[PDB]
Amino acid sequence: EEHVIIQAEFYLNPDQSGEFMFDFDGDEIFHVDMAKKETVWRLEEFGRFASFEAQGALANIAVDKANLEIMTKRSNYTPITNVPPEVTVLTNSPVELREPNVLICFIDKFTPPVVNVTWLRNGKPVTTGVSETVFLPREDHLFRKFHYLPFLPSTEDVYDCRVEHWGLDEPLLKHWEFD
Amino acid sequence: KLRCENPKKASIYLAQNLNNVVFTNKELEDIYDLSNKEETKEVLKKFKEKVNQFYRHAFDIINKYGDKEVFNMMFLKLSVVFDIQRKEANNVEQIKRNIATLDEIMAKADNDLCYFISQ
Amino acid sequence: DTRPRFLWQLKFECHFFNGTERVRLLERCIYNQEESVRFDSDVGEYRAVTELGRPDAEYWNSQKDLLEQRRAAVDTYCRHNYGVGESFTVQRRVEPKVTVYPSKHNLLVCSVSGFYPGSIEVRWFRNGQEEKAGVVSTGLIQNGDWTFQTLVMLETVPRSGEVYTCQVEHPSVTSPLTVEWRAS
Amino acid sequence: QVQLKESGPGLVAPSQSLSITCTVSGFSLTSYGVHWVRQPPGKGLEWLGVIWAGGSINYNSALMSRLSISKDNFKSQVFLKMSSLQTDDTAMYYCARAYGDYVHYAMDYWGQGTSVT
Amino acid sequence: SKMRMATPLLMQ
Amino acid sequence: DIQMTQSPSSLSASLGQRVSLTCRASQEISGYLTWLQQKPDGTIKRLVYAASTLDSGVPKRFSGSRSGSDYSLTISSLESEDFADYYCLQYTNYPLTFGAGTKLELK
Ligand SMILES: *[C@@H]1O[C@H](CO)[C@@H](O)[C@H](O)[C@H]1NC(C)=O
Ligand SMILES: *[C@@H]1O[C@H](CO)[C@@H](O)[C@H](O)[C@H]1NC(C)=O
Ligand SMILES: *[C@@H]1O[C@H](CO)[C@@H](O)[C@H](O)[C@H]1NC(C)=O
């Protein structure tokens, strides 16, 4: 038997972004939205059995911020290498026509964690029902991220997980279509 | 402020020796100047007032108690709040949340201070 | 935007072996793609992975009180959070939804989808004959929403009448889930 | 697992045609790109060209007008050609794998090497 | 009950 | 054509010693550097890519680094199978250029 529980946080400059989440064998338990000061559970059932106060994560980001600015001057402002992402488009289950499913855009092995993810249906951006995770950690210290588009599979639509990273030159578009 | 009857747990982050955490008056005005629309005028006065309330409360703690750990942690957490303020300085709801957040940080500062003195 | 970027990461990891008998705590600090400092519960202190993290290790390891609370974090943090969440994380049991379908007549795929945990066991049978020659598996796919999926493909298609059977053995079920596929 | 294997004739008479083949297993060429490198006996390496997963090919300016790189995704093998042989083409020929279709994806897995003298 | 958290340290 | 100057051509050291291989470019390469190892048998294996990202199947004694325009590959302790040839590689733009190379010798 082997189980792993991970608490992962990061801070980024000069975008001034942060994160705080919990991980179990590569699956997220909860994260805190610091803008709203609310604890968000990955599955709604998890809130009925355990509780976490989102207020305590604020002091962690305040330490992550002061750590990053100390490491930047120490490395002589050595920029991070913009590692381009490997992007995979999956589905939650085998797909069927006119039967609800969930498109998954696995954005893997990238750094830093800034991505302009946009679900494109026949070329136009879509935000109806779109869900996303937070930047999930990795063993090689790169990042994973899942973007979900609850969709009704059909043959008349094609989907693109347009990924914009600074390690690329043009936007990365990973295609998906039925059959 | 009498000692808290039931102080909560107090974490430690080793923030005793940080310098240059307080935003000067010039830096504050740059933050306020981002609030320039017709709907933020009423709430900005509240925000500036609470920030002024935060500054006096924070600078009162350093005077007698002089707890550098929670003083610096207050501004380090404030630095995170001003980051949210910078990205949205015309959001009425967020400013009120940042006011409540700044009151939580003051409440947490008192909560942590009454814990440390007893210990 | 072409300005340089600077990234800082922090991870706390609890490793569980045989329930809670052996617990390993691994705390890591990552600056720009490279781990610089780490805490190992077996070692019991911070070790500088690189020369960048060397000042941190000599600094964090000098605080006695925070090291004791970090060694004890196997109980107060790792074991505690294990008991808090084991009812929906470790004891979590979601049955696989197993289905079979032929691609294009070969490479018979057995879809094991929406199961938890990921410790799956898929075996192909030819009327009880466990076929091990043409089996190819895509691997264990993690969906990010506390589920898993996996496609296992069998290369050798049979003649008419040879009923291939995909058997799935998962901790969520005592009787293995069998989905049979027929022939021409 | 991921493996790359180079094969090709070793006898290269002066002023002839050359051809090298690289065979890959454990991945797909529709998702990865193949580089080509060569190494003269007892000296350094020299990048020749690259073909990406989409099919875009980028040769070397110094050795252009001679190099030629192709692929066959179904057969999972790569090809190299170098016309107008000479005495400096004596070297070891290698192949390597890189992800995607952009130069900033690093190469990961190498072959063993085929020889021409 | 409640999930707990570990707190980082500040570099020198 | 970016010119890579691999600082050592040959290095002699015993086992369990720290060695550094420095690679320098004539232009800005934006941290896109890959390190390689070629054993005397003639097989080549990647160690570090993106100048700081260790490969998955690599011992934890191989470290990549970047400091301005000076890149490096560091071996914290030398085993018996570490004595081989090493080549840096820039891939920021075409043509990809390798260093001359470094031969690691058992003293
Ligand atoms: C930063 O640059 C200074 C001045 O050239 C030099 O002395 C120092 O070693 C450099 N530090 C690093 C980490 O590159
Ligand atoms: C996302 O888009 C914004 C707006 O165009 C741009 O400034 C930013 O650089 C993008 N972020 C990326 C590519 O990571
Ligand atoms: C696993 O832990 C249990 C208690 O949780 C213990 O009884 C058992 O002996 C352990 N297994 C081994 C192999 O030591």
PDB file of N, CA, C and O in Angstrom, chain D residues 24-86:
ATOM      1  N   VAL D  24      11.696   3.428 -34.713  1.00  0.00           N
ATOM      2  CA  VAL D  24      11.318   3.868 -33.378  1.00  0.00           C
ATOM      3  C   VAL D  24      10.156   3.027 -32.869  1.00  0.00           C
ATOM      4  O   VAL D  24       9.267   2.628 -33.628  1.00  0.00           O
ATOM      5  N   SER D  25      10.179   2.746 -31.568  1.00  0.00           N
ATOM      6  CA  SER D  25       9.117   2.000 -30.912  1.00  0.00           C
ATOM      7  C   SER D  25       8.848   2.612 -29.545  1.00  0.00           C
ATOM      8  O   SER D  25       9.730   3.224 -28.938  1.00  0.00           O
ATOM      9  N   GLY D  26       7.617   2.445 -29.070  1.00  0.00           N
ATOM     10  CA  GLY D  26       7.216   2.964 -27.780  1.00  0.00           C
ATOM     11  C   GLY D  26       6.551   4.321 -27.804  1.00  0.00           C
ATOM     12  O   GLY D  26       6.234   4.853 -26.734  1.00  0.00           O
ATOM     13  N   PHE D  27       6.335   4.898 -28.981  1.00  0.00           N
ATOM     14  CA  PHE D  27       5.650   6.177 -29.124  1.00  0.00           C
ATOM     15  C   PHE D  27       5.165   6.284 -30.565  1.00  0.00           C
ATOM     16  O   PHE D  27       5.276   5.333 -31.346  1.00  0.00           O
ATOM     17  N   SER D  28       4.630   7.446 -30.922  1.00  0.00           N
ATOM     18  CA  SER D  28       4.131   7.697 -32.264  1.00  0.00           C
ATOM     19  C   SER D  28       4.832   8.909 -32.861  1.00  0.00           C
ATOM     20  O   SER D  28       5.201   9.848 -32.149  1.00  0.00           O
ATOM     21  N   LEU D  29       5.017   8.877 -34.180  1.00  0.00           N
ATOM     22  CA  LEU D  29       5.604  10.001 -34.896  1.00  0.00           C
ATOM     23  C   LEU D  29       4.600  11.110 -35.175  1.00  0.00           C
ATOM     24  O   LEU D  29       5.009  12.220 -35.529  1.00  0.00           O
ATOM     25  N   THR D  30       3.303  10.839 -35.025  1.00  0.00           N
ATOM     26  CA  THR D  30       2.287  11.877 -35.128  1.00  0.00           C
ATOM     27  C   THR D  30       2.297  12.826 -33.939  1.00  0.00           C
ATOM     28  O   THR D  30       1.638  13.869 -33.991  1.00  0.00           O
ATOM     29  N   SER D  31       3.028  12.491 -32.877  1.00  0.00           N
ATOM     30  CA  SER D  31       3.131  13.335 -31.700  1.00  0.00           C
ATOM     31  C   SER D  31       4.556  13.743 -31.364  1.00  0.00           C
ATOM     32  O   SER D  31       4.744  14.575 -30.469  1.00  0.00           O
ATOM     33  N   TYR D  32       5.559  13.194 -32.045  1.00  0.00           N
ATOM     34  CA  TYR D  32       6.951  13.491 -31.749  1.00  0.00           C
ATOM     35  C   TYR D  32       7.713  13.732 -33.044  1.00  0.00           C
ATOM     36  O   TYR D  32       7.338  13.230 -34.107  1.00  0.00           O
ATOM     37  N   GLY D  33       8.788  14.508 -32.942  1.00  0.00           N
ATOM     38  CA  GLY D  33       9.631  14.815 -34.080  1.00  0.00           C
ATOM     39  C   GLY D  33      10.995  14.168 -33.934  1.00  0.00           C
ATOM     40  O   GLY D  33      11.444  13.875 -32.826  1.00  0.00           O
ATOM     41  N   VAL D  34      11.655  13.949 -35.070  1.00  0.00           N
ATOM     42  CA  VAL D  34      12.909  13.206 -35.129  1.00  0.00           C
ATOM     43  C   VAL D  34      14.011  14.116 -35.650  1.00  0.00           C
ATOM     44  O   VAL D  34      13.895  14.680 -36.745  1.00  0.00           O
ATOM     45  N   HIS D  35      15.076  14.255 -34.868  1.00  0.00           N
ATOM     46  CA  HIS D  35      16.286  14.944 -35.287  1.00  0.00           C
ATOM     47  C   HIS D  35      17.272  13.956 -35.907  1.00  0.00           C
ATOM     48  O   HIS D  35      17.160  12.740 -35.738  1.00  0.00           O
ATOM     49  N   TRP D  36      18.245  14.496 -36.637  1.00  0.00           N
ATOM     50  CA  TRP D  36      19.317  13.705 -37.228  1.00  0.00           C
ATOM     51  C   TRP D  36      20.655  14.343 -36.895  1.00  0.00           C
ATOM     52  O   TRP D  36      20.852  15.537 -37.139  1.00  0.00           O
ATOM     53  N   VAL D  37      21.575  13.546 -36.354  1.00  0.00           N
ATOM     54  CA  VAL D  37      22.902  14.014 -35.980  1.00  0.00           C
ATOM     55  C   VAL D  37      23.927  13.038 -36.544  1.00  0.00           C
ATOM     56  O   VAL D  37      23.633  11.868 -36.791  1.00  0.00           O
ATOM     57  N   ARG D  38      25.144  13.535 -36.757  1.00  0.00           N
ATOM     58  CA  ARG D  38      26.234  12.697 -37.228  1.00  0.00           C
ATOM     59  C   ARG D  38      27.514  13.072 -36.496  1.00  0.00           C
ATOM     60  O   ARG D  38      27.650  14.176 -35.963  1.00  0.00           O
ATOM     61  N   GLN D  39      28.456  12.131 -36.473  1.00  0.00           N
ATOM     62  CA  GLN D  39      29.701  12.336 -35.746  1.00  0.00           C
ATOM     63  C   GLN D  39      30.879  11.699 -36.473  1.00  0.00           C
ATOM     64  O   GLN D  39      30.959  10.468 -36.564  1.00  0.00           O
ATOM     65  N   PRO D  40      31.809  12.498 -36.996  1.00  0.00           N
ATOM     66  CA  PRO D  40      32.997  11.920 -37.616  1.00  0.00           C
ATOM     67  C   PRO D  40      33.807  11.147 -36.595  1.00  0.00           C
ATOM     68  O   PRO D  40      33.782  11.460 -35.390  1.00  0.00           O
ATOM     69  N   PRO D  41      34.526  10.112 -37.030  1.00  0.00           N
ATOM     70  CA  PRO D  41      35.272   9.266 -36.083  1.00  0.00           C
ATOM     71  C   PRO D  41      36.281  10.069 -35.277  1.00  0.00           C
ATOM     72  O   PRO D  41      37.203  10.676 -35.826  1.00  0.00           O
ATOM     73  N   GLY D  42      36.100  10.063 -33.958  1.00  0.00           N
ATOM     74  CA  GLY D  42      37.019  10.740 -33.067  1.00  0.00           C
ATOM     75  C   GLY D  42      36.867  12.240 -32.986  1.00  0.00           C
ATOM     76  O   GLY D  42      37.802  12.919 -32.551  1.00  0.00           O
ATOM     77  N   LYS D  43      35.720  12.786 -33.385  1.00  0.00           N
ATOM     78  CA  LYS D  43      35.491  14.226 -33.341  1.00  0.00           C
ATOM     79  C   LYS D  43      34.070  14.479 -32.846  1.00  0.00           C
ATOM     80  O   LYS D  43      33.389  13.571 -32.358  1.00  0.00           O
ATOM     81  N   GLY D  44      33.619  15.727 -32.969  1.00  0.00           N
ATOM     82  CA  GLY D  44      32.382  16.159 -32.353  1.00  0.00           C
ATOM     83  C   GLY D  44      31.144  15.866 -33.181  1.00  0.00           C
ATOM     84  O   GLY D  44      31.195  15.308 -34.276  1.00  0.00           O
ATOM     85  N   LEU D  45      30.003  16.265 -32.626  1.00  0.00           N
ATOM     86  CA  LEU D  45      28.699  16.039 -33.233  1.00  0.00           C
ATOM     87  C   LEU D  45      28.277  17.237 -34.076  1.00  0.00           C
ATOM     88  O   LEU D  45      28.733  18.363 -33.864  1.00  0.00           O
ATOM     89  N   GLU D  46      27.389  16.984 -35.037  1.00  0.00           N
ATOM     90  CA  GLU D  46      26.886  18.030 -35.921  1.00  0.00           C
ATOM     91  C   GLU D  46      25.429  17.753 -36.252  1.00  0.00           C
ATOM     92  O   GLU D  46      25.111  16.714 -36.838  1.00  0.00           O
ATOM     93  N   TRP D  47      24.552  18.685 -35.889  1.00  0.00           N
ATOM     94  CA  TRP D  47      23.140  18.561 -36.225  1.00  0.00           C
ATOM     95  C   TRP D  47      22.946  18.720 -37.726  1.00  0.00           C
ATOM     96  O   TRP D  47      23.480  19.651 -38.336  1.00  0.00           O
ATOM     97  N   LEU D  48      22.184  17.807 -38.325  1.00  0.00           N
ATOM     98  CA  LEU D  48      21.930  17.830 -39.761  1.00  0.00           C
ATOM     99  C   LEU D  48      20.579  18.457 -40.086  1.00  0.00           C
ATOM    100  O   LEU D  48      20.504  19.437 -40.832  1.00  0.00           O
ATOM    101  N   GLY D  49      19.509  17.903 -39.535  1.00  0.00           N
ATOM    102  CA  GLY D  49      18.182  18.408 -39.792  1.00  0.00           C
ATOM    103  C   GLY D  49      17.214  17.924 -38.738  1.00  0.00           C
ATOM    104  O   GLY D  49      17.605  17.335 -37.729  1.00  0.00           O
ATOM    105  N   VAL D  50      15.935  18.187 -38.988  1.00  0.00           N
ATOM    106  CA  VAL D  50      14.869  17.780 -38.080  1.00  0.00           C
ATOM    107  C   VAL D  50      13.562  17.793 -38.856  1.00  0.00           C
ATOM    108  O   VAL D  50      13.352  18.633 -39.735  1.00  0.00           O
ATOM    109  N   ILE D  51      12.697  16.834 -38.544  1.00  0.00           N
ATOM    110  CA  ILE D  51      11.328  16.812 -39.038  1.00  0.00           C
ATOM    111  C   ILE D  51      10.407  16.725 -37.830  1.00  0.00           C
ATOM    112  O   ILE D  51      10.617  15.893 -36.940  1.00  0.00           O
ATOM    113  N   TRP D  52       9.419  17.611 -37.777  1.00  0.00           N
ATOM    114  CA  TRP D  52       8.523  17.688 -36.637  1.00  0.00           C
ATOM    115  C   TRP D  52       7.286  16.824 -36.866  1.00  0.00           C
ATOM    116  O   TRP D  52       7.071  16.269 -37.945  1.00  0.00           O
ATOM    117  N   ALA D  53       6.465  16.712 -35.818  1.00  0.00           N
ATOM    118  CA  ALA D  53       5.295  15.842 -35.881  1.00  0.00           C
ATOM    119  C   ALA D  53       4.329  16.268 -36.978  1.00  0.00           C
ATOM    120  O   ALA D  53       3.671  15.417 -37.588  1.00  0.00           O
ATOM    121  N   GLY D  54       4.230  17.572 -37.249  1.00  0.00           N
ATOM    122  CA  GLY D  54       3.366  18.042 -38.317  1.00  0.00           C
ATOM    123  C   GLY D  54       3.944  17.891 -39.707  1.00  0.00           C
ATOM    124  O   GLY D  54       3.189  17.923 -40.685  1.00  0.00           O
ATOM    125  N   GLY D  55       5.261  17.729 -39.820  1.00  0.00           N
ATOM    126  CA  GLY D  55       5.913  17.561 -41.103  1.00  0.00           C
ATOM    127  C   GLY D  55       6.850  18.680 -41.504  1.00  0.00           C
ATOM    128  O   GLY D  55       7.493  18.572 -42.555  1.00  0.00           O
ATOM    129  N   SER D  56       6.949  19.750 -40.719  1.00  0.00           N
ATOM    130  CA  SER D  56       7.858  20.836 -41.058  1.00  0.00           C
ATOM    131  C   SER D  56       9.303  20.389 -40.878  1.00  0.00           C
ATOM    132  O   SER D  56       9.672  19.823 -39.845  1.00  0.00           O
ATOM    133  N   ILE D  57      10.125  20.649 -41.892  1.00  0.00           N
ATOM    134  CA  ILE D  57      11.504  20.177 -41.939  1.00  0.00           C
ATOM    135  C   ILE D  57      12.433  21.381 -41.947  1.00  0.00           C
ATOM    136  O   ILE D  57      12.219  22.330 -42.709  1.00  0.00           O
ATOM    137  N   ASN D  58      13.467  21.333 -41.111  1.00  0.00           N
ATOM    138  CA  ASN D  58      14.459  22.398 -41.010  1.00  0.00           C
ATOM    139  C   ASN D  58      15.847  21.783 -41.130  1.00  0.00           C
ATOM    140  O   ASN D  58      16.308  21.102 -40.209  1.00  0.00           O
ATOM    141  N   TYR D  59      16.515  22.028 -42.257  1.00  0.00           N
ATOM    142  CA  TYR D  59      17.847  21.495 -42.488  1.00  0.00           C
ATOM    143  C   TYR D  59      18.906  22.453 -41.951  1.00  0.00           C
ATOM    144  O   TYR D  59      18.605  23.501 -41.377  1.00  0.00           O
ATOM    145  N   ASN D  60      20.169  22.086 -42.141  1.00  0.00           N
ATOM    146  CA  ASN D  60      21.299  22.931 -41.781  1.00  0.00           C
ATOM    147  C   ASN D  60      21.718  23.735 -43.004  1.00  0.00           C
ATOM    148  O   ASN D  60      21.744  23.207 -44.121  1.00  0.00           O
ATOM    149  N   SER D  61      22.029  25.015 -42.790  1.00  0.00           N
ATOM    150  CA  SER D  61      22.407  25.884 -43.900  1.00  0.00           C
ATOM    151  C   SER D  61      23.718  25.438 -44.534  1.00  0.00           C
ATOM    152  O   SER D  61      23.869  25.480 -45.761  1.00  0.00           O
ATOM    153  N   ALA D  62      24.681  25.015 -43.712  1.00  0.00           N
ATOM    154  CA  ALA D  62      25.986  24.622 -44.234  1.00  0.00           C
ATOM    155  C   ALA D  62      25.879  23.416 -45.159  1.00  0.00           C
ATOM    156  O   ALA D  62      26.523  23.375 -46.214  1.00  0.00           O
ATOM    157  N   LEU D  63      25.069  22.427 -44.787  1.00  0.00           N
ATOM    158  CA  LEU D  63      24.948  21.188 -45.544  1.00  0.00           C
ATOM    159  C   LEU D  63      23.681  21.123 -46.387  1.00  0.00           C
ATOM    160  O   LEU D  63      23.329  20.043 -46.870  1.00  0.00           O
ATOM    161  N   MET D  64      22.989  22.244 -46.570  1.00  0.00           N
ATOM    162  CA  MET D  64      21.805  22.258 -47.413  1.00  0.00           C
ATOM    163  C   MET D  64      22.196  22.005 -48.870  1.00  0.00           C
ATOM    164  O   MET D  64      23.373  22.039 -49.241  1.00  0.00           O
ATOM    165  N   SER D  65      21.183  21.729 -49.694  1.00  0.00           N
ATOM    166  CA  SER D  65      21.278  21.292 -51.087  1.00  0.00           C
ATOM    167  C   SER D  65      21.732  19.844 -51.205  1.00  0.00           C
ATOM    168  O   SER D  65      21.835  19.330 -52.325  1.00  0.00           O
ATOM    169  N   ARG D  66      22.008  19.172 -50.094  1.00  0.00           N
ATOM    170  CA  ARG D  66      22.350  17.756 -50.069  1.00  0.00           C
ATOM    171  C   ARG D  66      21.447  16.946 -49.155  1.00  0.00           C
ATOM    172  O   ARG D  66      21.094  15.812 -49.491  1.00  0.00           O
ATOM    173  N   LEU D  67      21.057  17.504 -48.012  1.00  0.00           N
ATOM    174  CA  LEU D  67      20.261  16.773 -47.038  1.00  0.00           C
ATOM    175  C   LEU D  67      18.830  16.580 -47.525  1.00  0.00           C
ATOM    176  O   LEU D  67      18.318  17.343 -48.349  1.00  0.00           O
ATOM    177  N   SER D  68      18.184  15.543 -46.998  1.00  0.00           N
ATOM    178  CA  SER D  68      16.787  15.260 -47.304  1.00  0.00           C
ATOM    179  C   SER D  68      16.232  14.372 -46.203  1.00  0.00           C
ATOM    180  O   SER D  68      16.777  13.297 -45.940  1.00  0.00           O
ATOM    181  N   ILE D  69      15.156  14.823 -45.564  1.00  0.00           N
ATOM    182  CA  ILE D  69      14.557  14.124 -44.435  1.00  0.00           C
ATOM    183  C   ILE D  69      13.090  13.872 -44.746  1.00  0.00           C
ATOM    184  O   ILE D  69      12.390  14.770 -45.227  1.00  0.00           O
ATOM    185  N   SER D  70      12.630  12.650 -44.485  1.00  0.00           N
ATOM    186  CA  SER D  70      11.242  12.273 -44.702  1.00  0.00           C
ATOM    187  C   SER D  70      10.790  11.395 -43.543  1.00  0.00           C
ATOM    188  O   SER D  70      11.546  11.133 -42.603  1.00  0.00           O
ATOM    189  N   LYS D  71       9.541  10.937 -43.613  1.00  0.00           N
ATOM    190  CA  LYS D  71       8.962  10.113 -42.562  1.00  0.00           C
ATOM    191  C   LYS D  71       7.901   9.202 -43.158  1.00  0.00           C
ATOM    192  O   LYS D  71       7.450   9.391 -44.290  1.00  0.00           O
ATOM    193  N   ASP D  72       7.513   8.201 -42.370  1.00  0.00           N
ATOM    194  CA  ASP D  72       6.339   7.377 -42.655  1.00  0.00           C
ATOM    195  C   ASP D  72       5.732   7.014 -41.303  1.00  0.00           C
ATOM    196  O   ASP D  72       6.222   6.108 -40.621  1.00  0.00           O
ATOM    197  N   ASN D  73       4.671   7.730 -40.919  1.00  0.00           N
ATOM    198  CA  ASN D  73       4.094   7.557 -39.589  1.00  0.00           C
ATOM    199  C   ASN D  73       3.540   6.151 -39.399  1.00  0.00           C
ATOM    200  O   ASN D  73       3.647   5.576 -38.309  1.00  0.00           O
ATOM    201  N   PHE D  74       2.931   5.586 -40.444  1.00  0.00           N
ATOM    202  CA  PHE D  74       2.364   4.246 -40.333  1.00  0.00           C
ATOM    203  C   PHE D  74       3.444   3.206 -40.061  1.00  0.00           C
ATOM    204  O   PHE D  74       3.263   2.319 -39.220  1.00  0.00           O
ATOM    205  N   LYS D  75       4.577   3.299 -40.760  1.00  0.00           N
ATOM    206  CA  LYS D  75       5.660   2.341 -40.574  1.00  0.00           C
ATOM    207  C   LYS D  75       6.571   2.688 -39.404  1.00  0.00           C
ATOM    208  O   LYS D  75       7.437   1.877 -39.061  1.00  0.00           O
ATOM    209  N   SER D  76       6.396   3.861 -38.794  1.00  0.00           N
ATOM    210  CA  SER D  76       7.136   4.251 -37.592  1.00  0.00           C
ATOM    211  C   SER D  76       8.645   4.247 -37.825  1.00  0.00           C
ATOM    212  O   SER D  76       9.422   3.829 -36.965  1.00  0.00           O
ATOM    213  N   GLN D  77       9.068   4.719 -38.997  1.00  0.00           N
ATOM    214  CA  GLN D  77      10.481   4.782 -39.337  1.00  0.00           C
ATOM    215  C   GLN D  77      10.802   6.107 -40.015  1.00  0.00           C
ATOM    216  O   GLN D  77       9.952   6.706 -40.679  1.00  0.00           O
ATOM    217  N   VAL D  78      12.043   6.555 -39.839  1.00  0.00           N
ATOM    218  CA  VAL D  78      12.517   7.828 -40.371  1.00  0.00           C
ATOM    219  C   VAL D  78      13.581   7.553 -41.425  1.00  0.00           C
ATOM    220  O   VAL D  78      14.213   6.491 -41.434  1.00  0.00           O
ATOM    221  N   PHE D  79      13.776   8.517 -42.325  1.00  0.00           N
ATOM    222  CA  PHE D  79      14.715   8.373 -43.429  1.00  0.00           C
ATOM    223  C   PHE D  79      15.621   9.591 -43.529  1.00  0.00           C
ATOM    224  O   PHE D  79      15.199  10.719 -43.258  1.00  0.00           O
ATOM    225  N   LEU D  80      16.871   9.351 -43.918  1.00  0.00           N
ATOM    226  CA  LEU D  80      17.822  10.403 -44.244  1.00  0.00           C
ATOM    227  C   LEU D  80      18.495  10.063 -45.565  1.00  0.00           C
ATOM    228  O   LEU D  80      18.692   8.891 -45.894  1.00  0.00           O
ATOM    229  N   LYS D  81      18.845  11.099 -46.323  1.00  0.00           N
ATOM    230  CA  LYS D  81      19.562  10.930 -47.578  1.00  0.00           C
ATOM    231  C   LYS D  81      20.600  12.035 -47.707  1.00  0.00           C
ATOM    232  O   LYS D  81      20.381  13.158 -47.245  1.00  0.00           O
ATOM    233  N   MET D  82      21.734  11.708 -48.330  1.00  0.00           N
ATOM    234  CA  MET D  82      22.837  12.658 -48.510  1.00  0.00           C
ATOM    235  C   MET D  82      23.535  12.318 -49.826  1.00  0.00           C
ATOM    236  O   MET D  82      24.370  11.412 -49.884  1.00  0.00           O
ATOM    237  N   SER D  83      23.184  13.052 -50.879  1.00  0.00           N
ATOM    238  CA  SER D  83      23.749  12.816 -52.197  1.00  0.00           C
ATOM    239  C   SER D  83      25.173  13.365 -52.283  1.00  0.00           C
ATOM    240  O   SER D  83      25.622  14.149 -51.441  1.00  0.00           O
ATOM    241  N   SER D  84      25.884  12.935 -53.328  1.00  0.00           N
ATOM    242  CA  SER D  84      27.229  13.413 -53.653  1.00  0.00           C
ATOM    243  C   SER D  84      28.191  13.178 -52.484  1.00  0.00           C
ATOM    244  O   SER D  84      28.717  14.103 -51.863  1.00  0.00           O
ATOM    245  N   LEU D  85      28.402  11.893 -52.207  1.00  0.00           N
ATOM    246  CA  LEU D  85      29.251  11.481 -51.101  1.00  0.00           C
ATOM    247  C   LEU D  85      30.692  11.943 -51.310  1.00  0.00           C
ATOM    248  O   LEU D  85      31.140  12.196 -52.432  1.00  0.00           O
ATOM    249  N   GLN D  86      31.419  12.051 -50.202  1.00  0.00           N
ATOM    250  CA  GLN D  86      32.822  12.441 -50.225  1.00  0.00           C
ATOM    251  C   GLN D  86      33.519  11.777 -49.041  1.00  0.00           C
ATOM    252  O   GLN D  86      32.942  10.927 -48.358  1.00  0.00           O
TER     253      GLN D  86
END
